[PDB]
Design a protein around this ligand. Structure first.
Ligand SMILES: CCOc1ccccc1-c1nc(-c2ccncc2)no1
Ligand SMILES: CCOc1ccccc1-c1nc(-c2ccncc2)no1
Lengths: 116, 116, 115, 115
């Protein structure tokens, strides 16, 4: 519930299904520790990444594997991935949705942050 | 169910709440006939605009009143509105989501079209 | 020089070349009167639309013929066109650039207003 | 000339001026080595990053320091930075422009790859 990812396809006008997403958290030593991962559903959504307990304050990186998606539709895209890096939960727990809209040579991302 | 509008605020990182939306349909005489209207909810969504019966084939215009939103947050924006114009249901009934992401000097829009 | 339009293609990663663009000014009776038009260049730009003398405060609509663009590339598009509607205000900077980034089911637009 | 970066501000409708940009090339051991950097100009552009000789095929990362930008304007931002990661491929056009459109909780990026 606290971290959700939504991915849309701007070419097809559809959810981007079966998109791999990897989440990292910056460790004390400044390396990126694996935090969670998953694949978007048939609605382009990925829930279930983490729990309120696990999702502590920190700097998080959400890596959306856009290059496998375009190639596994038969398209050679420009970007390797879309990376979204942000500090989370630094004034207490929030719920974050990271949304991404994909084209072969472009993407946009936005965050929706709500306080439960 | 067949036509939904979702509006997000890129400054606040939130749904864009209480955004007025007007939908028009192009008439035989090439004028824009009022079709439906409403306001986004606290989740930035507007459902209930039309029914499968009412939502026939045609050219539709979804006008999102972005200028009242920015001003009624105390911001003077650039655009008068965001207009999304498209042919609908021309190969049979589809479900359309029109999404818009707003900034004072910019917006983006995408469509998600699904076949029930 | 006061009004320029820049159009980009998010599918091919290129300027959107030979796109028709029509500019309208809102008239007293709430109708849209033709103001300027042209086709984007090889760099996706359209210059020469108006002059400082002609470009007075008011409500303008920039209609980009995205459907013809995508059709000419063999790609099925969603929108009839992209329309960007804005007020020109003399209290703000002098030169307006209307930029649009096109995909078949999506577009993005922004204004760069500079002195 | 082969690599340019353009940054725009969607809140103010202007170029994003004096934004720090760092470019990295991926090394054999999967680490990111510094390649080029600078600050955007008054037109939101950064030229002069590299030369044709230096800019070989590979994986590049363009990190835009969006958080400092927004802080200097007094605006609370979401992202630490914006990172654009791509492969340079010689089979495609010669000149790369990486464009980014910034908002406090969102950004858009596109590539314009031309000859
Ligand atoms: C939290 C975002 O959730 C959504 C949920 C349902 C449908 C769409 C979205 C969504 N739309 C956009 C959007 C992307 C590009 N241009 C305009 C809008 N980003 O996310
Ligand atoms: C003001 C002229 O604009 C430009 C001039 C030169 C090159 C590129 C651009 C440009 N990039 C974008 C853009 C839009 C949405 N997401 C990312 C980028 N819009 O315009």
């Amino acid at each position: 519930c606290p971290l959700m990812v939504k991915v849309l396809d701007a070419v097809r006008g559809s959810p981007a299904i079966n998109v791999a997403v990897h989440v990292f958290r910056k460790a004390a030593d400044d390396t990126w520790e694996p935090f969670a991962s998953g694949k978007t559903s048939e609605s382009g959504e990925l829930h279930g990444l983490t729990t309120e307990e696990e999702f502590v304050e920190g700097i998080y990186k959400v890596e959306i594997d856009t290059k496998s998606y375009w190639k596994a539709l038969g398209i050679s895209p420009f970007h390797e991935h879309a990376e979204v890096v942000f500090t989370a939960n630094d004034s207490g727990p929030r719920r974050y949705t990271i949304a991404a809209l994909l084209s072969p040579y472009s993407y946009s991302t936005t965050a929706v942050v709500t306080n439960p």
